[PDB]
Ligand code: NA
């Protein structure tokens with residue numbers, strides 16, 4: 035259910051339904067995120083996967099996919 | 110230092126008066142310019158200085174320099 | 186010179202979540218004060234408060250409320266009500282250089298400043314703080330968090346003056362109309378309710394502590410055994426509008442702001458001098474050619490303040506002192522939001538023709554004799570009413586409101 | 591309406607503890623930014639700040655300073671300076687209903703709010719909090735803590751508007767003079783400098799983090815590799831006075847406040863819109879029949895803000911070329927204190943005939959081309975100067991100051 039709750043996180047952060055959240059969906063260009071949203075979204079991901087994402091690797095998470103890289107790229 | 114000197118130092122610093130005004134007869138409110146907030150803080154500063162806890166009923170009676178000296182001498 | 190009128194109200198308070206609920210509470214002398222387990226648990230001696238009885242969770246759009254502390258939420262809900270009450274469409278007030286907002290809080294957000302510091306010192310450090318604490322905690326949060334989503338293009342700032350805050354906001358809004366710089370200014374404020382703020386008043390000995398078992402009797406302005414104010418939270422907003430602009434659009438006008446006093450004691454930081462209040466009331470009454478029919482006193486239920494204010498009233502009015510009541514005996518003291526909330530109570534009294542009672546006077550203070558402190562709801566045609574708001578630092582505000590035509 | 595002039599000033603800043611030290615620093619292009627072990631130890635990514643280099647111990651009497659946080663201390667010392675610089679004695683400005691004070695901070699005291707909460711949660715509870723936290727941490731602390739000891743009897747409140755705070759204070763003071771309500775209003779502000787407040791800005795990503803090893807280079811407005819502002823603390827105060835009153839007492843007059851803009855973006859919470867600033871500058875220039883010779887930009891050294899302000903300037907002025915410089919490249923960003931401090935820098939430039947440099951522009955941003963951005967101290971006879979201040983919540987202020995006759 036990793037997909038389900040990641041879509042829920044992103045959608046509650048940004049106000050988007052699970053369907054709107056696609057592998058290629060951009061937080062900024064598709065789902066309306068500003069820079070503060072992006073900070074909060076990284077926060078919320080770190081909470082769910084109990085991981086610490088460094089500034090350098092966080093700066094490269096920009097779609098569902100760039101972050102799927104963490105959820106299941108590491109765990 | 111002695112109890113008396115330490116009490117008088119606290120009172121003078123707290124109330125912004127020179128040591129020569131902190132005589133044993135002096136009243137915090139009538140002679141040394143203390144207001145209600147000063148009273149709160151002065152009890153606090155005595156409690157901290159002498160590692161003691163002053164019940165509110167006792168603190169209400171500590172209205173003069175001598176009263177403070179007497180209390181601290183009598184509660185070690 | 187340009188004249189300023191009030192064309193819309195909104196309120197979230199311990200005695201009601203809109204002006205109809207508030208009206209009913211005022212007529213009934215109903216208390217907004219409840220027992221607080223939060224305050225008790227924090228180690229305080231005062232366990233009573235005037236809480237807003239509304240879960241605000243999810244009432245404001247996520248993208249707007251992410252920036253907001255409770256003071257801003259209460260003020261925002263109040264402003265939505267005031268806009269609807271004034272009959273203003275989005276096209277009428279949005280993206281308009283002549284429409285402004287002046288609204289404040291006394292304290293910003295103690296809760297979120299402490300949250301930010303706790304988070305920073307915890308194991309995640311900066312990552313636990315998140316990006317929204319500044320707008321929640323900054324002193325201008327109430328104006329910033331409203332002017333942005335409501336598309337305000339005119340003036341945009343907060344006045345802060347402790348317990349006079351939102352009264353000064355309304356006064357400054359009047360000045361903007363009088364200077365001809367704005368046609369409408371939304372004015373008011375808000376205050377959060379939390380132990381983080383309330384415990385610092387308890388530490389001063391400023392809050393009621395002897396009536397925790399009977400919360401509705403703790404706030405008791407002018408009673409001989411009053412023992413401090415009861416802290417409260419909430420918000421309020423009024424639509425201050427230039428008169429010809431209001432008439433031309435067929436606005437409903439509650440009252441004209443015919444007087445605004447603002448003075449300073451320059452004396453004691455926490456206790457009122459009295460001559461400051463006298464000058465404030467006189468400044469608000471200057472040029473007002475009708476008598477004050479009703480005076481909403483600041484009256485917080487402190488031993489220090491209640492009768493100093495009465496002595497000032499006696500000096501101002503002499504033998505012709507107006508009918509007086511202290512609505513804080515019902516509502517508690519919402520600090521930065523008190524002024525606008527009391528302006529609104531006063532406007533409802535003016536609009537509906539009654540005086541709200543000064544409750545819980547079981548034994549009237551010796552120094553309060555020979556006055557007309559109203560203790561039962563009293564129907565009366567009012568024309569001119571006055572509200573006082575005073576704050577720490579010796580800051581004074583008075584507003585005088587009068588029916589038109 | 592009545593004309594308003596500046597007859598005295600005072601300042602405590604990262605680049606000097608009085609106006610003589612500040613003037614020397616401005617002429618030298620001297621940085622006030624140092625490395626902060628406090629910020630680094632708290633866990634922040636930004637380890638640089640614009641600190642006040644002053645031992646304030648014993649400068650303020652016990653009975654007065656017991657109420658004060660650092661914002662109030664800085665503002666109080668600035669006010670002492672400004673009173674002396676204006677030539678005013680107690681019989682003239684004390685106990686005078688025509689003399690007021692409008693001065694604010696952006697954040698109150700995060701330090702003392704966190705101190706209060708920590709003490710309450712400690713083993714001694716309410717007894718550790720003490721009775722002075724409310725006056726330190728309330729939003730109106732700066733006005734309350736100054737109006738009381740200086741015996742101010744006129745207006746007394748704080749304006750708060752994030753990084754526009756003390757500019758709006760000055761503008762409000764001008765309005766009081768214009769309305770005929772006051773003869774003198776002391777206006778300005780202060781801000782404390784502490785990890786408790788600064789870490790929330792770091793959590794937003796708003797502070798410089800790439801230049802900790804070279805602190806004097808970190809604040810670099812208009813440089814292509816700017817990465818956020820450098821936080822700073824301090825205070826400032828100006829004496830705003832009605833013209834005929836000033837002339838009648840033979841006052842020294844720095845300048846007339848000939849324009850004041852205050853507007854609202856109604857758009858984004860943390861990023862400027864541009865058209866808000868355009869309207870604000872234009873409002874401040876309305877009726878001013880001389881060109882702007884120098885513009886002290888708000889210019890904080892953020893990627894998001896610096897160039898938006900330049901685009902606004904281009905729209906306002908077109909082919910005219912006001913000299914521009916961003917003094918925050920030297921001073922850092924003192925938040926609520928920034929407006930009054932920059933007003934003071936601009937008055938010093940007007941009074942002493944020079945343009946302070948915009949420093950640390952190693953590679954000019956491509957979008958900052960075509961503007962007269964001064965990067966070297968330049969002597970020049972100025973007549974009219976402008977200072978911008980903007981803040982979160984889309985709040986904008988502009989002040990325009992011009993030599994008398
Ligand atoms: Na009132």
Ligand code: NA
Nearest residue numbers: 886887932978
């Ligand atoms: Na500026």
